[PDB]
Amino acid sequence: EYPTVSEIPVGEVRLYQIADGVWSHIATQSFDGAVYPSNGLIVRDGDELLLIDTAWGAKNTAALLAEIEKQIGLPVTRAVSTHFHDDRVGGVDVLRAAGVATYASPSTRRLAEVEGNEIPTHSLEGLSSSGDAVRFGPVELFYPGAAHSTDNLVVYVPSASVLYGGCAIYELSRTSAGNVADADLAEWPTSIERIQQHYPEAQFVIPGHGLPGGLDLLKHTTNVVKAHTNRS
Ligand SMILES: [Zn+2]
Ligand SMILES: [Zn+2]
Ligand SMILES: [Zn+2]
């Protein structure tokens, strides 16, 4: 029942209930003559919502807020971007204009600034060293080390056992490495091991793009990263 680029007109967003008070958001974007899906997370925080990641652009992100307003009807008070690339911070101004507090690590804020990308307002302290975790309302934020990017974070919902891996985790259908221009291929498998060791109990694993699964998405990503590393 999980939405694919099949069920999603570009410019629109669908929500998907993963567990009680946890949803993913799914959007699509054209890039380089192909159409890709993109996932983020929505976590109920009492009577408000914490959003993880934009819906990859201003137009998509305005559709996301409208769709949250339609389908959940609770206010989005805070948002966290999991790394500095446009599919995660693109739309941060839309969030800001709607009165959402936008957050990212100083590492992410620095890299977005260098990249000329949108910059989340608020800074997340205590994530600068591999293996650091901090509590952020109904989730834990975890910096596993460099992987897809040097600043990538992952997000865990303790109450529902949902691990959101963002773009550091690939879906099973992904069989070759994506865009790795900003990746640390040498450290990626070690970073995934930190994730494995810290959340052995996760029941659902949501990748940055594509279908959810279980913890074998971690091993899958390792397999793919290692194959790419060994490319001839
Ligand atoms: Zn990225
Ligand atoms: Zn603020
Ligand atoms: Zn991504």
Side-chain angles (χ1 to χ4, degrees), residues 1-5 8-9 11 13-58 60-192 194-196 198-202 204-231:
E1 45 179 308
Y2 200 82
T4 59
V5 321
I8 303 173
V13 166
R14 294 279 100 82
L15 307 183
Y16 182 87
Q17 186 139 33
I18 301 171
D20 186 59
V22 188
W23 301 254
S24 60
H25 59 87
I26 312 88
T28 56
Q29 194 50 272
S30 299
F31 192 74
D32 231 54
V35 175
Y36 302 87
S38 191
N39 295 325
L41 205 72
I42 303 168
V43 183
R44 187 180 178 153
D45 194 347
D47 294 327
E48 52 193 43
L49 293 180
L50 166 67
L51 174 61
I52 314 291
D53 288 330
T54 65
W56 192 351
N60 276 352
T61 303
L64 169 67
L65 287 181
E67 187 68 3
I68 290 173
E69 191 176 33
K70 202 58 226 210
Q71 198 104 5
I72 306 170
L74 259 7
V76 176
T77 60
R78 296 187 285 179
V80 170
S81 294
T82 56
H83 73 276
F84 73 99
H85 286 159
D86 235 70
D87 64 326
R88 307 287 116 196
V89 296
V92 152
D93 199 44
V94 171
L95 292 183
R96 190 173 300 106
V100 177
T102 57
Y103 282 80
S105 68
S107 186
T108 293
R109 296 180 77 255
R110 173 190 305 122
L111 284 162
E113 159 115 312
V114 164
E115 199 68 14
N117 292 19
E118 299 191 49
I119 304 161
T121 297
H122 284 263
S123 292
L124 291 168
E125 282 340 293
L127 284 170
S128 67
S129 163
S130 301
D132 286 343
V134 311
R135 202 259 264 239
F136 198 74
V139 306
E140 191 167 76
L141 302 177
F142 183 71
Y143 172 53
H148 167 84
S149 60
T150 60
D151 60 323
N152 47 208
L153 302 179
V154 305
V155 180
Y156 185 62
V157 192
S159 78
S161 319
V162 175
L163 175 68
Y164 169 81
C167 304
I169 302 303
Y170 281 4
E171 69 169 317
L172 293 177
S173 285
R174 199 112 167 245
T175 242
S176 80
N179 145 69
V180 294
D182 293 327
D184 191 323
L185 288 177
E187 287 303 323
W188 200 331
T190 295
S191 301
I192 291 194
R194 294 201 192 87
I195 300 178
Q196 168 58 62
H198 203 98
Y199 300 104
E201 79 275 20
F204 314 75
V205 175
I206 314 314
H209 306 268
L211 255 46
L215 275 166
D216 55 17
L217 271 67
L218 299 213
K219 188 41 167 160
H220 171 76
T221 305
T222 296
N223 294 344
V224 172
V225 170
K226 290 183 164 201
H228 186 264
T229 291
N230 290 340
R231 69 195 191 278

